[PDB]
Write an enzyme that holds these catalytic residues in place. Structure first.
Site, short mmCIF file in Angstrom:
data_model
loop_
_atom_site.label_atom_id
_atom_site.label_comp_id
_atom_site.label_asym_id
_atom_site.label_seq_id
_atom_site.Cartn_x
_atom_site.Cartn_y
_atom_site.Cartn_z
N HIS A 1 0.84 -1.19 0.00
CA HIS A 1 0.00 0.00 0.00
C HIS A 1 0.88 1.25 0.00
CE1 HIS A 1 -3.55 2.38 0.45
NE2 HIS A 1 -3.14 2.89 1.60
N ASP B 1 0.83 5.21 -0.34
CA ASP B 1 0.06 6.44 -0.31
C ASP B 1 0.77 7.58 -1.02
OD1 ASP B 1 -2.19 5.71 1.49
OD2 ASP B 1 -0.49 5.23 2.81
N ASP C 1 -8.14 1.01 1.18
CA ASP C 1 -8.03 2.05 2.19
C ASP C 1 -9.04 3.20 2.26
OD1 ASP C 1 -5.21 3.86 3.69
OD2 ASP C 1 -6.62 2.44 4.56
N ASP D 1 1.49 -1.35 4.54
CA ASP D 1 1.98 -0.06 4.07
C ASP D 1 3.44 -0.09 3.63
OD1 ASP D 1 -0.53 0.67 4.86
OD2 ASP D 1 0.11 2.28 6.22
N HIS E 1 -6.92 9.29 -1.05
CA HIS E 1 -7.66 9.22 0.21
C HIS E 1 -7.01 9.91 1.41
CE1 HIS E 1 -5.38 5.42 -0.21
NE2 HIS E 1 -5.16 5.56 1.08
O1 LIG Z 1 -4.91 4.92 9.61
C1 LIG Z 1 -5.17 5.68 8.44
C2 LIG Z 1 -4.01 5.92 7.48
N1 LIG Z 1 -3.13 4.71 7.56
C3 LIG Z 1 -1.90 4.73 6.69
C4 LIG Z 1 -2.16 5.18 5.27
O2 LIG Z 1 -2.59 4.08 4.47
C5 LIG Z 1 -3.19 6.39 5.19
O3 LIG Z 1 -3.63 6.59 3.85
C6 LIG Z 1 -4.42 6.20 6.07
O4 LIG Z 1 -5.25 7.36 6.04
ZN LIG Z 2 -3.74 4.72 2.46
#
Ligand SMILES: OC[C@H]1NC[C@@H](O)[C@@H](O)[C@@H]1O
Ligand SMILES: [Zn+2]
Ligand SMILES: *[C@@H]1O[C@H](CO)[C@@H](O)[C@H](O)[C@H]1NC(C)=O
Length: 1014
Positions: A60, A62, A174, A311, A441
Site C-alpha cells: 500500500h 500512499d 483504504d 503499508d 484518500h
Molecule cells: O490509519 C489511516 C491511514 N493509515 C496509513 C495510510 O494508508 C493512510 O492513507 C491512512 O489514512
Molecule cells: Zn492509504
C-alpha cells in the site's frame, strides 16, 4: 430507458433496509474481536473438492500522507518498485499487484531502456499485475465523480500507452467507507470485478454470517441490474497481514515474516513469526491452513483470496526473500499433504476473480444482489470516520474550483488543434495530474500532515495557473479574426477573474479594471459557458470608477448595477467585526448571456457621470454606535440604524426575512404564498475530555452542538435592482445571503482562528415534517436516502455532503447545494446541518501523529432552494433514491460550473469578435457534456475528440419544459469521419455509430463518444 423513479429494485441486500434492522452491538467475538468463533467441517474439502488459495503480495503506497509524494517516492516507493522488478524477474512464480499509477509512472520514466523492457515483460507475463490502474486510490466520500473518472482515465491511459494493459479488476483497500459511484464508473469503464475493505465492522459481521461478502453491486435505482459489478468485501478489521490470513490476528501475525526484529517490526499479540523449516513446517501449516479454512467459511466458492502486504511493504531485498522463501516452504508442504485438500500459490487479483467465476459457472455458487453505500465507516466501537468529511475545508473547496478549471481548459482548447509550441498538451497534463493526485484518500480527505497538505495546495495552484494559461490562449484564438490572429504562446491576452476563489476576505487576487479619460476609456471582457445550453448568470468585475456602462459587441446597452467593494475586518481596537468600503474600487454587475459551450463578449465603458443603464445599490449598516463609511465617488451615501429585522426581495423572486442578527428567518416564494419558517443558526461542537478525541479522521462530539454566542453583530444590507444581500460578522464567520431573483446564494467566510477543539456547524431549522429521513448525494452523481438512527451515536448520523442535501415532507422540500464537500446530517425533523470547519488539538490514533491546527480562511458557497413538491412525481416510500428538481439542479450547476470571466489585458483587441458557439445545440437541461477532450496531438492525420455525456434525472413537477435541440457531440466539430461509443476512459471502442451520430443517453446514464475528423 429504464424508469429510475417508479420501479423499486428487488435486491437481496439493500443497505438502508439492512441498517434499519441491524442492532450494531459491539460485543467481543473472541480472537476475531468483531465477529465470532468460526467453525468449519473438515470434511467439506477433499480430493474431489479442494480449497484453492491465492496469496496475493501487495504494497500500500500512499501518494502523500505523513510524507509528500516525492518524499515517499525517494525514501520508499522507488526502492519497492526497483526491487519488485528484480525479485519478480528472478523468481517466475512470485506475484505482485500494484494500484497507484502516479508512483508507477514516476518510476518507469526514470528507468533505463533495459529495465523498461524487463518491466514490460513481467507485466506481460502476469507476474506484476495492475489493479484498478487509477492515478491514485481515491477517497470515495468527498470526491466528485468527474474527478474520480479523471484520475482513473489518467492512470489507465498511461497504462495502455506504456504497459499495453487495461485493468478490469479494482482494488480499494483504504478509502474510509465506500461509494456505489465506484462500481458505476468502473462498470462503464470495462471492469468486471472490484474489491473493497473499509466498511463498518457491524456490516462485515452481518454480511459474513449470511455469506454475502461477495455480491453483485448495482445502483440503487437500477431495477434491471445492468449496472451490476461483482464486488468482494474483505471480512476483517484491516488489510494488513495479521487481518488477512484468517480470523485470529495472533496467529496471522506469525505469518508476516517481516516482523522478526532486524526490520524493527514485531507482533503486538506477543507471538513472533518463526522461520519455516522442514522441522516445523507441518505444525506451522496446520495452524495456517486452519485460519484459511475459517476464512473460507465466510465465502461461497472453494477459491480463497489471501492478501499479503501492508503499508510500503516489499521494499528491502531481504524482505522479498523472507516473505517469498517462507511461503514457498509452506506451499510445498501443504500442496503435497493430501489430508489438507488445499492447493495454495502466489497469485494476482485477476487470477482470484477468474477462479471465482469459473466456480460460479460450474454452478457451485450463486451470488446475492446488493444496492446502497458503505458510509459512515467505523473501524471499532463508536469511532465513526465522519470527521474527514470536513477536515481541511479550504482544500476541499479548492478541489471543486480546480475540477471546473480543468474541464473548462480542456473544453476551450479542444476546439482547435494546437502547435506543439503552444504547450497546450503539456499544461493540461500537468493540471489533470495534480488534480488527480489530490483525489487520493489522504488528499481531499484532509488527513495528511501539514507540510503534505501544503504540497497538495502548491501543486493545485500550479494546476490552476496552467488552466488559466490554456483557457486564455483558447479564448483569444476563438474570438479573433483568423487573418489577424497572431499568438505569442507565452503572452497573457486575458486575465481570469474569479469572484469566489480564493474569495473576498481570503485573498485579494482579482484585478481591478482601471478606466479613465486620461488612460483607458473601455475594456473588453469575455464570459465562457462550459454547459451545453444557453445560460444567463449575473457576473461582476472590479472597476476603478462607479460610472461604468455595459454593452454587448453589437453595442446594445446592458442593464448593470454598481455596488461598493466591502471588506470585513476584526477591529482589534473596538473589538468588533465590521465592514469597510473601498474608496477606489467598485463592483459592476450585469447579466451575461452565453451560448452553449460558448463565449460572449461585452464592453465596459467609463463616463463622467452616472450612465443611463447603470443603477446604484443602497447600503444600510445596522449596529449601535456607528461611524461614517465614505465610499469615494460612489453615488449614494451609506445609511445607518440600530439592528432590526429586515425583509428583501429581488425581481419577482422570493421575499426573504432576516432576524436583527442578519440571519434568515423565513422565505416567501410568492407575493401570495406564506412566510415559510427557515432559520439559519450557527452552533459549535466540542471534544470529549475523557476517552477518544476527535481528530482529522474521527468526529467524537461531546454531545449535541451548542449555539454560538453572537452578541450584537454588525449587519450590512445592500439593496440593488439586480442583486441584494445581507451580510453579518459573526464570531468565526462572515455570513452572507445574496439574492439575484431566484434561490438565494449563501457564502460563509470561515475563519475558526485559534478556537481549539471546536467544530463550527451551520444549521437550518424548519417546519418540514421530514421525521428521520433526509437525502445526501454521493460524489455529485446521485442522491441517496438517509435515515437518522437514534440507536447510533450522533457522529454515525453524519454523512458526506459532496454537493447537496435535502429534507422534505408531503408538500415542502428544502435543498442545500454546496460548492465544496463537507460533512452534514439532519439530527431532528425539519433540520439540515453542515460542518464549516474543525480545529482539533489532538491526534485520533490513526497514525497521522497530529491534530488539525492549520486552519485558514475559506469561502464556502451554497444555494438554498425552498420548493413546493406536492405536485412532483416522486419515488415510492420504499425507493432508496431521491432526485433533484430542475431549480435545485441548476443551482448546483451555478456553484460547480459557473461562467468563466476573462479580462482583456492589452488596451486594444484588434479583430475581436462578439461571440462563439451561437450555433451550438442547446441541449435539454438534464444533459451535460461532463468532458470534452481532444485526444490527439496536431501531427495526427486523423484527429480524435472525446466526450463524456451525463444525463441526470430531474423530478417532473408539472412544468412544461420544452423547446430544446438534440445534442450530437459527434458533429460539434466539422469533417467527422466516424463516431464511436467508448468506455468512459476512451480506451476501448464499444460501438461504431451509423450516420456518425452520437445518440443522447438515458436518465442517470453516462456514456462516452469519440469523433474522428479527417
Ligand atoms: O490509519 C489511516 C491511514 N493509515 C496509513 C495510510 O494508508 C493512510 O492513507 C491512512 O489514512
Ligand atoms: Zn492509504
Ligand atoms: C498489446 O497486447 C495485445 C494482446 O492483448 C497484443 O496483441 C499486442 O500486440 C500488444 N501490443 C504491444 C506490442 O504493445
Amino acid at each position: 430507458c429504464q424508469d429510475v423513479v417508479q420501479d423499486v429494485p428487488n435486491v437481496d441486500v439493500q443497505m438502508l433496509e439492512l441498517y434499519d434492522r441491524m442492532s450494531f452491538k459491539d460485543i467481543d467475538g473472541g480472537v476475531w474481536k468483531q465477529g465470532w468463533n468460526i467453525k468449519y467441517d473438515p470434511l467439506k474439502y477433499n480430493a474431489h473438492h479442494k480449497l484453492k488459495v491465492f496469496v496475493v503480495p501487495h504494497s500500500h503506497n500512499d501518494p502523500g500522507w505523513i510524507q509528500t509524494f516525492e518524499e515517499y517516492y525517494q525514501h520508499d516507493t522507488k526502492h519497492i518498485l526497483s526491487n519488485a522488478l528484480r525479485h519478480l524477474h528472478d523468481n517466475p512464480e512470485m506475484k505482485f499487484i500494484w494500484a497507484e499509477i502516479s508512483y508507477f509512472a514516476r518510476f518507469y520514466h526514470d528507468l533505463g531502456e533495459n529495465k523498461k523492457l524487463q518491466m514490460k515483460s513481467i507485466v506481460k507475463n502476469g507476474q506484476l499485475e495492475f489493479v484498478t490502474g487509477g492515478w491514485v486510490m481515491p477517497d470515495e466520500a468527498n470526491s466528485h465523480w468527474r474527478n474520480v473518472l479523471l484520475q482513473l482515465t489518467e492512470g489507465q491511459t498511461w497504462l495502455k500507452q506504456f504497459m499495453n494493459v487495461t485493468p478490469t479488476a479494482s482494488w480499494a483497500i483504504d478509502p474510509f467507507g465506500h461509494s456505489p459511484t465506484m462500481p458505476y464508473i468502473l462498470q462503464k469503464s470495462g471492469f468486471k470485478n472490484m474489491l473493497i475493505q473499509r466498511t463498518h465492522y457491524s456490516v462485515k459481521k452481518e454480511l459474513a454470517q449470511q455469506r454475502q461478502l461477495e455480491f453483485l453491486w448495482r445502483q440503487i435505482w437500477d431495477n434491471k441490474g445492468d449496472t451490476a459489478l461483482f464486488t468482494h468485501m474483505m471480512p476483517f478489521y484491516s488489510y494488513d497481514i495479521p487481518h488477512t490470513c484468517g480470523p485470529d490476528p495472533k496467529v496471522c501475525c506469525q505469518f508476516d515474516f517481516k516482523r522478526m526484529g532486524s526490520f524493527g517490526l514485531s507482533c503486538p499479540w506477543k507471538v513472533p513469526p518463526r522461520t519455516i523449516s522442514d522441522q516445523n513446517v507441518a505444525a506451522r501449516s496446520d495452524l495456517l491452513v486452519d485460519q484459511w479454512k475459517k476464512k473460507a467459511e465466510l465465502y461461497r466458492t472453494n477459491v480463497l483470496l489471501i492478501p499479503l502486504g501492508d503499508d510500503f511493504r516489499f521494499k528491502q531485498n531481504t524482505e522479498w526473500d523472507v516473505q517469498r522463501v517462507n511461503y514457498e516452504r509452506l506451499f510445498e508442504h501443504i500442496n503435497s499433504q493430501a489430508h489438507f485438500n488445499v492447493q495454495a500459490q502466489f497469485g494476482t487479483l485477476q487470477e482470484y476473480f477468474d477462479a471465482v467465476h469459473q466456480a460460479e459457472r460450474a454452478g457451485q455458487a450463486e451470488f446475492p444482489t446488493l444496492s446502497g453505500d458503505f458510509f459512515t465507516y467505523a473501524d471499532r466501537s463508536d469511532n465513526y470516520w465522519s470527521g474527514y468529511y470536513t477536515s481541511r475545508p479550504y482544500h476541499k473547496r479548492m478541489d471543486r474550483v480546480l475540477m471546473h478549471y480543468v474541464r473548462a481548459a480542456e473544453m476551450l482548447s479542444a476546439w482547435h488543434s494546437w502547435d506543439g509550441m503552444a504547450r497546450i498538451e503539456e499544461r493540461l497534463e500537468q493540471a489533470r495530474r495534480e488534480l488527480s493526485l489530490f483525489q487520493h484518500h489522504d488528499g481531499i480527505t484532509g488527513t495528511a500532515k501539514t507540510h503534505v497538505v501544503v504540497d497538495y495546495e502548491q501543486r493545485m495552484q500550479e494546476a490552476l495557473k496552467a488552466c488559466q494559461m490554456v483557457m486564455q490562449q483558447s479564448v483569444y484564438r476563438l474570438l479573433t479574426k483568423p487573418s489577424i490572429y497572431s499568438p505569442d504562446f507565452s503572452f497573457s491576452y486575458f486575465t481570469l477573474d474569479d469572484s469566489r476563489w480564493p474569495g473576498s476576505g481570503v485573498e485579494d487576487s482579482r484585478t481591478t479594471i482601471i478606466l479613465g479619460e486620461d488612460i483607458l476609456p473601455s475594456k473588453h471582457v469575455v464570459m465562457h459557458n462550459t454547459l451545453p445550453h444557453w445560460r444567463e448568470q449575473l457576473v461582476d468585475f472590479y472597476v476603478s470608477s462607479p460610472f461604468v456602462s455595459v454593452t454587448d459587441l453589437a453595442n446594445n446597452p446592458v442593464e448593470a448595477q454598481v455596488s461598493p467593494v466591502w471588506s470585513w475586518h476584526h477591529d482589534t481596537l473596538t473589538k468588533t467585526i465590521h465592514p469597510q468600503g473601498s474608496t477606489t474600487k467598485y463592483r459592476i454587475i450585469f447579466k451575461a448571456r452565453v451560448p452553449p459551450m460558448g463565449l460572449a463578449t461585452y464592453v465596459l465603458t467609463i463616463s463622467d457621470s452616472k450612465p443611463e443603464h447603470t443603477s446604484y445599490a443602497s447600503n444600510l449598516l445596522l449596529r449601535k454606535n456607528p461611524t461614517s463609511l465614505p465610499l469615494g465617488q460612489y453615488p449614494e451615501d451609506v445609511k445607518f440604524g440600530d439592528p432590526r429585522e429586515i425583509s428583501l426581495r429581488v425581481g419577482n423572486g422570493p421575499t426573504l426575512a432576516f432576524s436583527e442578527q442578519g440571519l434568515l428567518k423565513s422565505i416567501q416564494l410568492t407575493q401570495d404564498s406564506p412566510h415559510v419558517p427557515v432559520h439559519f443558526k450557527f452552533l459549535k461542537y466540542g471534544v470529549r475530555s475523557h476517552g477518544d478525541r476527535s481528530g482529522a479522521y474521527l468526529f467524537l462530539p461531546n454531545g449535541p452542538a451548542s449555539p454560538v454566542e453572537l452578541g450584537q453583530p454588525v449587519v450590512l444590507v445592500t439593496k440593488g435592482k439586480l442583486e441584494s444581500s445581507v451580510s453579518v460578522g459573526l464570531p468565526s464567520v462572515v455570513h452572507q445571503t445574496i439574492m439575484r431573483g431566484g434561490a438565494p446564494e449563501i457564502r460563509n467566510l470561515v475563519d475558526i482562528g485559534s478556537l481549539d477543539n471546536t467544530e463550527i456547524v451551520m444549521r437550518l431549522e424548519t417546519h418540514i415534517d421530514s421525521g428521520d429521513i433526509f437525502y445526501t448525494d454521493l460524489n455529485g452523481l446521485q442522491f441517496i436516502k438517509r435515515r437518522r438512527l437514534d440507536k447510533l451515536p450522533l457522529q454515525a448520523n453524519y454523512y458526506p455532503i459532496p454537493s447537496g442535501m435535502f429534507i422534505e415532507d408531503a408538500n415542502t422540500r428544502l435543498t442545500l447545494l454546496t460548492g465544496q464537500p463537507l460533512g452534514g446530517s439532519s439530527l431532528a425533523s425539519g433540520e439540515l446541518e453542515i460542518m464549516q470547519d474543525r480545529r482539533l488539538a489532538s491526534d485520533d490514533e490513526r497514525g497521522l501523529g497530529q491534530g488539525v491546527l492549520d486552519n485558514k480562511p475559506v469561502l464556502h458557497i451554497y444555494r438554498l432552494v425552498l420548493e413546493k413538491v406536492n405536485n412532483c412525481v416522486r419515488p415510492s416510500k420504499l425507493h432508496p433514491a431521491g432526485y433533484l428538481t430542475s431549480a435545485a439542479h441548476k443551482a448546483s450547476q451555478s456553484l460547480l460550473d459557473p461562467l468563466d470571466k476573462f479580462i482583456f489585458a492589452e488596451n486594444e483587441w484588434i479583430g475581436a469578435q462578439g461571440q462563439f458557439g451561437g450555433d451550438h445545440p442547446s441541449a435539454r437541461e438534464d444533459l451535460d457534456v461532463s468532458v470534452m477532450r481532444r485526444l490527439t496531438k496536431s501531427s495526427a492525420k486523423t484527429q480524435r475528440v472525446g466526450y463524456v455525456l451525463h444525463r441526470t434525472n430531474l423530478m417532473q413537477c408539472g412544468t412544461p419544459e420544452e423547446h430544446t435541440q438534440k445534442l450530437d457531440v459527434c458533429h460539434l466539430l466539422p469533417n467527422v469521419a466516424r463516431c464511436e461509443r467508448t468506455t468512459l476512459t476512451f480506451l476501448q471502442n464499444l460501438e461504431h455509430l451509423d450516420g456518425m451520430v452520437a445518440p443522447e443517453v438515458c436518465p442517470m446514464e453516462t456514456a462516452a463518444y469519440v469523433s474522428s475528423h479527417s
